[PDB]
Design a protein around this ligand. Structure first.
Ligand SMILES: [Br-]
Ligand SMILES: [Br-]
Ligand SMILES: [Br-]
Ligand SMILES: [Br-]
Ligand SMILES: [Br-]
Ligand SMILES: [Br-]
Ligand SMILES: [Br-]
Ligand code: NA
Length: 129
């Protein structure tokens, strides 16, 4: 599923992502834009053999099991395919664990390079919330 901008903002707010660990909703919407272009089915392989899955591009090196990343962990206790669903609950719950692990949203390289320090409230402007 490819979400609309304000549709995804509403969905993230309903799952408690707004201001989670101090990050305002626009930070999450911006990160989803540059990680996946709002597409729940996005996948990308990394150089080390792991793969990033879903709207927030969660990495199988640490967070989910895809059957093909030797040596990795599964800290969210989930099959990576669950991160590709039209329903974002699994991605949101896993993102809450990731952003709590010490480095905040710098865990998402696209957020650091394209959202951090910018006018992220622009990403929820006009939305009915
Ligand atoms: Br957009
Ligand atoms: Br594996
Ligand atoms: Br394969
Ligand atoms: Br594990
Ligand atoms: Br949803
Ligand atoms: Br932080
Ligand atoms: Br915001
Ligand atoms: Na894994």
């Amino acid at each position: 599923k490819v979400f609309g901008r304000c549709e995804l903002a509403a969905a993230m707010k309903r799952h408690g992502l707004d201001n989670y660990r101090g990050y305002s909703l626009g930070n999450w919407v911006c990160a989803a834009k540059f990680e996946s272009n709002f597409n729940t089915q996005a996948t990308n392989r990394n150089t080390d053999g792991s793969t990033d899955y879903g709207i927030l591009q969660i990495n199988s090196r640490w967070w989910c099991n895809d059957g093909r990343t030797p040596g990795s962990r599964n800290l969210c206790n989930i099959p990576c395919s669950a991160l590709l669903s039209s329903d974002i609950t699994a991605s949101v719950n896993c993102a809450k664990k990731i952003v709590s692990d010490g480095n905040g949203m710098n865990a998402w390289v696209a957020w650091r390079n394209r959202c951090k320090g910018t006018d992220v409230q622009a990403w929820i402007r006009g939305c009915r919330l």
